C-alpha cells in the first residue's frame, strides 16, 4: 500500500454521512492564537484559535507494515463530528486548508484554525484579574450515547492587545427541551486581560 | 439494519425535491428558541437576533422497521426534503451557525433545528422602557400553500444572560394569508418577541 | 402523474441553459417589483438599500403536463429550470436573495419565480426628506438576450411595504423601454420601475 | 439546428480548460464605466462599477437555418483569465454570468463588476481631476497564447463625473517567467462634482 | 499531443488528493512578491497586505513528452495537487484576487502564483519611524511534515504599488523547522520579514 492506494480506498469506502460508532469519543482542545476585537459593552469577543479535534474511525484503518503511518485527507471525504460553539454569534471562518490526519490505526485528527465571534462575559477585561470568557462546544445533533466530548499561551500571538492568564476546561452533559437524551459539551474558560 | 444501511437507503431513495404530502398538507411545527439579541436600532426599527429555528414535520417515505435498529439518525439536510420556510420581515439572509443536520426518527418524524443569526425589520419602539418592545417575526412557507404546507406553533430558557437585553414574553400566533399573485392561502406563524433593554 | 413523477421529468428533461423560445418569437417575461422595505438612504452619495420581491413570470411549454389527474402546480429549484437573465442596471451590490430559490411551474408551462431580494442601487435620492419625496428609478432587463429573444413587460400596488420602515411609499410607476447598446446591433428591452418615496417623521 | 441543439453541442464538446489557440487568441478589453462609488484621496483607493466587455474568438464553437447567436453559461466555455493587477478586492460580478456565442465562433462576455483599486486619486477634487490607471491582462497566458487589445453608461447620480478615458496596450516581462505578458492600461480621468 | 490532449490527461489522471512524493519530500518554493500595504494599525498590531504568493513544486505524474507539444499549460488548481500552505499569523482567510490557474511545464514543474489580500497579526511598531516596522509572516504546510513537504525561499519592490501609503525598505526570508505539541514530526515554514514604513510628508 502507498499513499495513492490508501487515499483511493478512503475515498471510495469512507461514509462521511455515517458516524463511526461501535459512543465515538471526541477530544476537543482549543489552542488560542489571538484575541482581536473585545467589546465590554456588548459582551462580544473575536477570537482566533485552533480547534484540535480527535476521534477514532476503525473503518479507515489499514495494515501499515510496509505503508505510510499517516495520510492527509480532505474532510469532505471523512465523517466529522458536528461540533458547534453554542455561544458563537458568527459562523466559523475556517482559515486553513480543510485537511485531516488519518493514522493507520484509524485515529483521525482535524485541527482547523478558526476565527469566530462569541457572546460571553467580557467584564473585567481591563483589570488585572481579567475577564473570563466561557466557550461552549458540543455535538449539535448527536447525544451522549453517540458522541461524547472530552478535554485533552503556547501559540498565542505576542502582538495581541491581550494576554492569556489561564485556560481551564470543563465537561458537561445537558438535557434540552426538544429531546429526551443528554448532549455532552466542553466549556473552555478563557481568562484574559488587556496588556499595558 | 444499522446506521450505515439506514443512511444509505435515505440517500438513495429520499427525494429532497419532493414534498412528502400524504393522502393533505404536511404539518410543519415551528418554534423559535431565542438565544441572543445583539443589536437593536430604535431609529431604523431593525434588530439582530440569534435563535434556534426548531422545525418539525413528518416524512413517511423515510420510515424504517426499528425492531433491531437505531430509533434515530442524523442526516444532512441536502439529502432530505425540507420545508421552504422564510421570515417575511427578514432583511438579511439567514446565517446558519450550526452543522446542517436533521434528526430522522424511525417513524418518519423529521426535526431540524439550526441556530440562526438574522436581521429583522420590526417594531423596536419602547425597547428602553419597562413594558419593552414587541418585535413580531413572520415565518411561513415561501412557495407552498395551505393545502401543501400548514404551519403550527409548538421563553428565556436558552437566552444568553450576557445579552444587553432580556425577554419578557414570547407569544405565537398562526395566520392564513392570501397574496395578490396566487389564489390559494399561505399559512404563517407570527412569533411576538417582547423584550427590553436591561 | 404525481408530484414525484412531474419533478423527475422536469429534472431529467428541462434544459436550464436553453431559452424556451417558441417559433422564433421572444419569451414574454413579466416583471413586477413588490417593495417590502427601504433600509438605508444616502442623499449625499445617491444610494439606497431596498428589499423587494422580484416577481418574475414567463412561459416554458416544454414543462407542461397533462393535469387531468395530476397536480396543477409544483415547486421546482431554479437550478433545474431555465430562468431569464434579468439584471438591475443601476444596482451597485450583487442581489442578496433572502428566500428559498424555488419557482412555481404550472401544468400549462407557466413559470413564476418571486425571490425576496436585498440590493443597493444608485439613483436619485434628492428630495427624500420633502413632502413630494424622492423618485428612485430602477432599470431591470435581460443582460444578454435582445428583444427578439426576451421581451420584458410590467404587470399593481405599499401593499407589502413594512410599516416599520423610516420610509413610506407615495407612488410606484412602471415604464417599458427598448435600448440599443454600443456592443450589439440589436435592441434590449428593460423595465424602469419608478419608486416615489419619502422619509416619515 | 435550433438553440437546444447548439447549446447541447457546446456543452458536450467545448473544452473550458482549453485555450482556443489557432496555430495567440486575440482578446478585446473595453471597460464601460457605470459608477464611481467611493474615493479616498488619503489611501489612494477607489471603488468602481464597470462593464468588463471582453471579446474573443473560439472556432470550435462555430456552427452552420439556425440562430446567429446563443447565450451560454461561462462555466461551459473557455474564458480568458483576465485580472486587474492593481485591484485590492476580488471582482464582485453583479450580473448573470452568461456569454454571447455567435455562429462564427466569436464570443463576447460583458459582466458588470464592482471592484476596489489602488491607484492615483490625487487631484480628484480639482478641475483637471484625478487619473486612475487600471491594468488588465491575462494572469497566466503570455503574448503568444493571449494578446489583449483596446476597442456613455455612467450614472448621472454619481458624485463624480468622467472627463476622459484613454486606453494603452503594454507588454511586460516578469521575473518569474521568460515570456512577455500583455496588458491593457485604462486611464480613467475623473473628478468630484461641485 | 496538443493542449486539449494534455489537459484531458491531466484532468483524467492527476490525483489532487495525492501528494506527489517521489522517494523524498516534495520541495516547495515560496516567494512573496509584495504588491500593496493597505491598512496598518499600530495599536492592534494588524496589517492588511496584498501579495503574490508564488509557489513552485514538482509533480512528475503530470510530465509529458514535449517533442511536438506545448512546453506549458494552464490548469485549474482544482485538477492538481496543491501544497496545503497556510500563513500561521493570518487573521483573515486568504482572499484570492486572481483566476485560480497554475502552470504545468512538460517536465512536471508546477507553478501557482495567486494574488492574495490577507490581514496579518505582526509587529507594526516603528512603522512611522525612519527604520520602519518589521512584519514577520510565517508560511508553511499545515498538515505535511518535513519528510512530506519541505519549504524553501527563492526584488523587494519590484511590483510594489507606488500609490501605497507605505514603502518597502527590505524583505528577508528565513527557513525554520518546528515541532508542535500535537505531533512527533517537524514541520517546515518560511518566515518572510517585511521591513516597511510610512512614506514621509
Ligand atoms: Br435536529 C436537532 C435536535 C436538537 C438540537 N439541539 C438540541 C440538543 C443539543 N444541541 C443544541 C441543538 C439540534 N438539532
Ligand atoms: Br414562485 C413564488 C410564488 C409565490 C411566492 N410568494 C407568495 C406566497 C406566500 N409567500 C411569499 C412568496 C414566492 N414565489
Ligand atoms: Br455577452 C453580453 C453582450 C451584451 C451585454 N450587454 C449589452 C446589452 C444589454 N445589457 C447590458 C450588457 C452583456 N453581455
Ligand atoms: Br503560474 C503563474 C505564473 C506567472 C504569473 N504572473 C506573472 C505574469 C503575468 N501577470 C502576473 C501573474 C501568474 N501565475
Ligand atoms: Br490534522 C493537523 C495536524 C497538524 C496541525 N498543525 C500542527 C503542525 C503544523 N501546522 C500547524 C497545525 C493541524 N492539523
The 3-class SS string of chain E reads: CCHHHHHHHHHHHCCCCCCCCCCCCEEEEEEEEEEEECCCECCCCEEEEEEEEEEEEECHHHCCCCCCCCCEEEEEHHHCCCCCEEECCECCCCEECCCCEEEEECCCEEEECCEEEEEEECCCCCCCCCCCEEEEEEEEECCCCCCCEEEECCCCCCCCCCCCCEEEEEEEEEEEEEECCCCCCEEEEEEEEEEEEECCC
Q: How far is B176 from chain A (nearest CA, A)?
A: 27
The three grid cell numbers given for residue B141, joined into one nine-digit string: 412557507
Longest CA pairwise span in chain C (Å)? 59
Q: Which residues of A touch E (CB under 8 A)?
A: 3-4, 7, 11, 34, 36, 48, 52, 72-74, 77, 93-97, 99-101, 109, 111, 113, 115, 154, 157, 159-161
Residue of A nearest to E14 (CA): A4
DSSP class of residue C25 equals: P
> With contacts defined as CB-CB under 8 Å, which chain C residues touch B85?
100
**Contact state of C46 with D157 under an 8 Å Cβ cutoff:** yes
Backbone angles phi, psi at E2, to 5 degrees: -110, 180
Contact B177, B136 (CB under 8 A): no
> With contacts defined as CB-CB under 8 Å, which chain E residues touch D85?
35, 115
Q: How far is B155 from chain C (nearest CA, A)?
A: 24
Resolution in A, one decimal?
2.7
Residue with CA closest to ligand 5 atom 7: E180
Q: Which ligand is nearest to the CA of A107?
A: 5
The three grid cell numbers given for residue A89, joined into one nine-digit string: 454569534
* Nearest CA-CA partner of C183 in D75, D111, E143: D111
Q: Which ligand is nearest to the CA of C189?
A: 3
> With contacts defined as CB-CB under 8 Å, which chain D residues touch E118?
none
User: Domain B1-198, what architecture?
Assistant: Distorted Sandwich (2.70)
> Domain residue spans in chain A?
1-196
State in Å: Cα E10 to ligand 4 middle.
20
> With contacts defined as CB-CB under 8 Å, which chain E residues touch A73?
17
The three grid cell numbers given for residue D60, joined into one nine-digit string: 470550435
DSSP class of residue A163 equals: E
Enumerate the H helices of B67-194 as residue ranges: none
Could you say which of 2.60.40.1180, 2.40.30.170, 3.30.43.10, 2.70.170.10 is the CATH number of the domain covering A1-196? 2.70.170.10
Which are the contacts of B145, defined by CB distance < 8 A and separation ≥ 6? Answer: B182, B184, B185, B186
**Contact state of D114 with C124 under an 8 Å Cβ cutoff:** no
Backbone angles phi, psi at A112, to 5 degrees: -75, 150
* Nearest CA-CA partner of C19 in C138, C143, C107, C108: C143
Beta bridge partners of A99: A74
Distance CA D115, CA A98 (A): 28
Residues within 6 Å of ligand 1 by CB: A 140-141, 176, 178-179, 183; B 102-103, 111-113
Distance CA A30, CA A167 (A): 9
CATH code of the domain occupying E1-201: 2.70.170.10
Cell 423529521 identifies what position?
Answer: B110
Distance CA B56, CA B83 (A): 9
Distance CA D151, CA A123 (A): 61
Cell 437573465 identifies what position?
Answer: C85
The 3-class SS string of chain D reads: CCHHHHHHHHHHHCCCCCCCCCCCEEEEEEEEEEEEEEEECCCCEEEEEEEEEEEEECHHHCCCCCCCEEEEEHHHCCCCCEEECCECCCCEECCCCEEEEECCCEEEECCEEEEEEECCCCCCCCCCCEEEEEEEEECCCCCCCEEEECCCCCCCCCCEEEEEEEEEEEEEECCCCCCEEEEEEEEEEEEECC
Cell 458536450 identifies what position?
Answer: D12
- 3-class secondary structure, B160: coil
Distance CA D51, CA C87 (A): 13
Q: Kindly state if the Cβ of D184 falls inside 6 Å of ligand 3.
A: no
Distance CA A101, CA A57 (A): 12
Check whether domain D1-194 has CATH 2.70.170.10, yes or no = yes
Q: Which ligand is nearest to the CA of A87?
A: 1
Neighbours of A74 (CB within 10 A): 16
Distance CA D103, CA D65 (A): 11
Contact D2, D67 (CB under 8 A): yes
Q: How far is E2 from chain D (nearest CA, A)?
A: 10
H or E element at residue C52: strand C47-59
Which are the contacts of E83, defined by CB distance < 8 A and separation ≥ 6? Answer: E26, E28, E55, E57, E141, E144, E149
Q: Which ligand is nearest to the CA of A72?
A: 5
* Nearest CA-CA partner of C100 in B87, B186, B79: B87
Which are the contacts of A159, defined by CB distance < 8 A and separation ≥ 6? Answer: E45, E89, E121, E122, E123, E124
Q: Which chains touch B (3 or more CB pairs under 8 A)?
A: A, C
Burial B134-167 (b: 16+ CB within 10 A, else e): bbbbbbbbbbbbbebbbbeeeeeebbbebbebeb
**Sheet of strand C86-88: strand arrangement:** C86-88, C134-142, C187-199, C167-180
Distance CA E165, CA E168 (A): 10
Backbone angles phi, psi at B94, to 5 degrees: -65, 125
DSSP string, A78-145: S----EEETTBSS--EE-S--EEEEETTSEEEE--EEEEEEE---TTTTSSS-EEEEEEEEESS--TT
DSSP class of residue C91 equals: B
Cell 404550472 identifies what position?
Answer: C106
CA distances, D151 to each of A78, B13, D28, D31, E127 (Å): 51, 54, 6, 9, 44
Which are the contacts of D5, defined by CB distance < 8 A and separation ≥ 6? Answer: none
**Contact state of C122 with D158 under an 8 Å Cβ cutoff:** yes
- Cα dihedral C63, C94, E51, E161 sign: positive
What experimental approach yielded this model? X-ray
Q: How far is D65 from chain E (nearest CA, A)?
A: 30
Distance CA D78, CA D121 (A): 35
**Contact state of E165 with D43 under an 8 Å Cβ cutoff:** yes
Residue of B nearest to C4 (CA): B18
Q: Which residues of B touch A (CB under 8 A)?
A: 3-4, 7-8, 11, 33, 36, 38, 50, 54, 74-76, 79, 95-99, 101-103, 111, 113, 115, 117, 157, 160, 162-164
Region at C164 (left for phi over 0; alpha for psi -120 to 50; beta for the rest): alpha
Residue with CA closest to ligand 2 atom 12: B142
State in Å: Cα E93 to ligand 5 middle.
17
Contact B53, B83 (CB under 8 A): no
Cell 489612494 identifies what position?
Answer: D44
Amino acid at each position: 500500500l502507498d499513499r495513492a492506494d490508501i487515499l483511493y480506498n478512503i475515498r471510495q469506502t469512507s461514509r462521511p454521512d455515517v458516524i463511526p460508532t461501535q459512543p465515538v469519543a471526541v477530544s476537543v482542545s482549543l489552542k488560542f492564537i489571538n484575541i482581536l476585537e473585545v467589546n465590554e459593552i456588548t459582551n462580544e469577543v473575536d477570537v482566533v484559535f485552533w480547534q484540535q479535534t480527535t476521534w477514532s474511525d476503525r473503518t479507515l484503518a489499514w495494515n501499515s507494515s510496509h505503508s505510510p503511518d499517516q495520510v492527509s485527507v480532505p474532510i469532505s471525504s471523512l465523517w466529522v463530528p458536528d461540533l458547534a460553539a453554542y455561544n458563537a454569534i458568527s459562523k466559523p471562518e475556517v482559515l486553513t486548508p480543510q485537511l485531516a490526519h488519518v493514522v493507520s490505526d484509524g485515529e483521525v485528527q482535524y485541527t482547523p484554525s478558526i476565527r469566530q465571534r462569541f457572546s460571553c462575559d467580557v467584564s473585567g477585561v481591563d483589570t488585572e484579574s481579567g475577564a473570563t470568557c466561557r466557550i461552549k462546544i458540543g455535538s449539535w445533533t448527536h447525544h451522549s450515547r453517540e458522541i461524547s466530548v472530552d478535554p485533552t499561551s503556547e501559540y498565542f500571538s505576542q502582538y495581541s492587545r491581550f494576554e492569556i492568564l489561564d485556560v481551564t476546561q470543563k465537561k458537561n452533559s445537558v438535557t434540552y427541551s426538544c429531546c429526551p437524551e443528554a448532549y455532552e459539551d466542553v466549556e473552555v474558560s478563557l481568562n484574559f486581560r488587556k496588556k499595558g
